[PDB]
């Protein structure tokens, strides 16, 4: 792809994080701790899942960033509306304000409703995410496989400001402790 010149510097918003997440000093990495991280509760925190938002809000333009997913077994990545539900159970879908892909149980899927099987020959270690606000597009790229396309959401109805979205996944297996990391420009 040729989206690299739209690169934006994303940082994580501590205030939105589930209470078990640990965000690095530079706000560029996040991992799920094995206990509550001793923060107060607030209406912004995702309560039921190990999720966090980027601090940046996008309402126009073209934006690109990259995320390192090395040695993880489960994660979700993409964008979401600023006003998505934080508390209780919900599905990741465009109806609920999410444009995401995931890894789960050795398969990759897009967060449509119902979910869509992805076709990935080279398991990615870094994911590129491109948003074209005006066009209504969210695309995902396999940086490990020379930038090959993973998935495009088109005809998106964002209906609000967008925020970068992350889920580090649970670590029931003991094989999913590694962080998500925002890769340097």
Binding site for ligand GTJ (CB under 6 A): 18, 20, 48-50, 170
* 62-68/107-110 β-pairing: unpaired
- Shortest spacing between CB 65 and ligand GTJ, in angstroms: 25
Closest approach of ligand GTJ to the CB of residue 20, in Å? 4
Closest CB to ligand GTJ: residue number: 20
Nearer to ligand GTJ, 49 or 90 (CB): 49
Beta carbon of residue 171, minimum distance to ligand GTJ (angstroms, whole number) = 8
**Residue linked to tokens 């899927």:** 109
Q: How far apart are CA 117 and CA 126, in angstroms?
A: 19
Residue 144, φ and ψ in degrees, nearest 5: -65, -35
How near is the Cβ of 112 to ligand GTJ at its closest, in Å?
A: 24
Which CB sits closer to ligand GTJ, 1 or 87? 87
- What is each CA distance from 118 to 77, 94, 131, 149, 170, in whole angstroms? 14, 17, 19, 10, 22
Return the SS3 of 5: helix
Number of residues written out for the chain: 185
> Least distance from C-beta 120 to ligand GTJ, angstroms?
27
For the chain, give the longest Cα–Cα distance. Answer: 43
Q: Decide whether 35 or 60 has the Cβ nearer to ligand GTJ.
A: 35
DSSP state of 162: E
Nearer to ligand GTJ, 74 or 150 (CB): 74
DSSP-derived letter for residue 146 is T
Q: Which two tokens stand for residue 68?
A: 């390192």
Shortest spacing between CB 18 and ligand GTJ, in angstroms: 5
Give whichever of 104 and 170 is closer to ligand GTJ, judged by the CB atom: 170
In terms of CB distance, is 18 or 100 closer to ligand GTJ? 18
């Amino acid at each position: 792809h040729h989206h690299h010149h739209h690169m934006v510097h994303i940082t994580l918003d501590r205030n939105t994080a589930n209470s078990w997440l640990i965000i690095s000093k530079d706000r560029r990495q996040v991992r799920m701790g094995d206990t509550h991280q001793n923060v107060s509760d607030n209406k912004e925190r995702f309560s039921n899942y190990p999720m966090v938002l980027g601090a940046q809000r996008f309402s126009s333009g073209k934006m690109y960033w990259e995320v390192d997913v090395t040695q993880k077994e489960a994660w979700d990545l993409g964008v979401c509306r600023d006003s998505v539900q934080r508390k209780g159970q919900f599905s990741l879908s465009p109806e609920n304000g999410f444009w995401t892909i995931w890894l789960w149980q050795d398969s990759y899927e897009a967060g449509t409703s119902p979910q869509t099987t992805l076709h990935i020959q080279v398991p990615p270690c870094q994911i590129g995410i491109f948003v074209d606000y005006e066009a209504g597009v969210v695309s995902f790229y396999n940086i490990t496989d020379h930038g090959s396309l993973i998935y495009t959401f088109s005809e998106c109805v964002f209906a609000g400001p967008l925020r970068p979205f992350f889920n580090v996944g649970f670590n029931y297996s003991g094989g999913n402790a590694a962080p998500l990391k925002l890769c340097p420009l």
